[PDB]
Amino acid sequence: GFPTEPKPGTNQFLTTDDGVSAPILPNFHPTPCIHIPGEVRNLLELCQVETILEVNNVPTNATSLMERLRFPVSAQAGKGELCAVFRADPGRDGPWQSTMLGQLCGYYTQWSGSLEVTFMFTGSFMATGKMLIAYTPPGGPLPKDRATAMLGTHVIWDFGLQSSVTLVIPWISNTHYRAHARDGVFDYYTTGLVSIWYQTNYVVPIGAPNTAYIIALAAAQKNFTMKLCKDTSHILQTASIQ
């Protein structure tokens, strides 16, 4: 026969190897493919769809799970009080875990690109107010007050007919890609911090609720990309599935 010489790797079964395999059914023809709505071509299509960000990931009670989906805002004392805070890191344990983006990230080792968070005010029509959403790039410790938070990337949000506002977390990194940030050494890939402050105050007339809620929705921008597939950190199974 034709002189050959097998090399290392012979007989191995590489999970991700893309080769040819003998077909079990000769001349078999699959059922025609009808037209079906909502076909997906690339996962990045899903990373751009906003899903609810659990900024208020505090309640763990059985009856209080639905309230992690929104955080409160109310009449204050007028000293630029802090409202909420959270890390901007997508593939890190925290608020982003409730989003589709955060979930898809779990399947990739690295990501790159700008992120965006849209805040929707669900108070009453008579309620007014201005907030200051700030994004603090790496190195900046959690701003102690508004006067410190406003020194970074931010946006002053005015409640009105347009219920929502979008905070764009621009891609400000030293490296082209970021691996998932965790506590310790990998905190090198942290994205930064987001913090909502009262620019002025939540004002309301007599007869209207003194407390309203905000719902945060998060997704990725058009320049967002991911690479190097891996398995999500969690496996939803304890014993064999029956």
């Binding site: 009808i34 037209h35 989906l69 108070g123 009453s124 007919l161």
Partner: protein
């Protein structure tokens, strides 16, 4: 753009606080191609008598409501001429124009998430412990026009997060902004036609993400009404009327 009118059949809907219109998956309802079809009998396309707006029951939004859902081919199977055709024919096919309406005042507040979830399969709490393989009753999987209330909205009673329900054709009703949501859904299934009785192509979910609130004195009764109209309805495989 805030005002709109939806006319189909002999019914017209009006609104002055809308938020555009969503066309599920960027596709308008259409009839079945001659190459996508299999059933050889000529279908019935009743048009105006079935493709019109049907207004189902009204729900009351309370400061403690969890949310409701309606399975779609189903909600209409016992109403008007659409229902008759759905009962007399084996095969059914159609898209829908769903219009959820709920108005309040400039002093009320709250936000409803109105979404369409295809193949909305319901699960059970499995006896609480999770060791009992129980299943949802017929009354819950196909609630009819009265809809059904969610017991655990956070997981949509199916073990999936509602926070991601926005990857589905949806719209919100934020009382300070709009008083209705309009979603147009094309026929979605892996088959060109299917039974309107055994199968429910999708489910309509109306869930309060931001609780309703107002001061004592403002009208406390805030209804949520569901109006829907079939589109491009086609039926085939005629026989006697079957209820289920």
């Amino acid at each position: 753009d805030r005002v709109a009118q939806l006319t189909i059949g002999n019914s017209t809907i009006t609104t002055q606080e809308a938020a555009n219109i969503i066309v599920g998956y960027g596709e308008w309802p259409s009839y079945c191609s001659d190459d996508d079809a299999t059933a050889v009998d000529k279908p019935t396309r009743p048009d105006v008598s079935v493709n019109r707006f049907y207004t189902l029951d009204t729900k009351l939004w309370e400061k403690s409501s969890k949310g409701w859902y309606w399975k779609f081919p189903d909600v209409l199977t016992e109403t008007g001429v659409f229902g008759q055709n759905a009962q007399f024919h084996y095969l059914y096919r159609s898209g829908f124009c769903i219009h959820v309406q709920c108005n309040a005042s400039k002093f009320h507040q709250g936000a409803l998430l109105v979404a369409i979830l295809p193949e909305y399969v319901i699960g059970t709490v499995a006896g609480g412990t999770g060791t009992e393989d129980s299943h949802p009753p017929y009354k819950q999987t196909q609630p009819g026009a009265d809809g059904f209330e969610l017991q655990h909205p956070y997981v949509l009673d199916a073990g999936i997060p509602i926070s991601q329900l926005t990857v589905c054709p949806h719209q919100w009703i934020n009382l300070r902004t709009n008083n209705c949501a309009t979603i147009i859904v094309p026929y979605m299934n892996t088959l060109p036609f299917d039974s309107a009785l055994n199968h429910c192509n999708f489910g309509l979910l109306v869930v309060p993400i931001s609780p309703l609130d107002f001061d004592q004195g403002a009208t406390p009764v805030i209804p949520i009404t569901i109006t829907l109209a079939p589109m491009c309805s086609e039926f085939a495989g005629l026989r006697q009327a079957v209820t289920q």
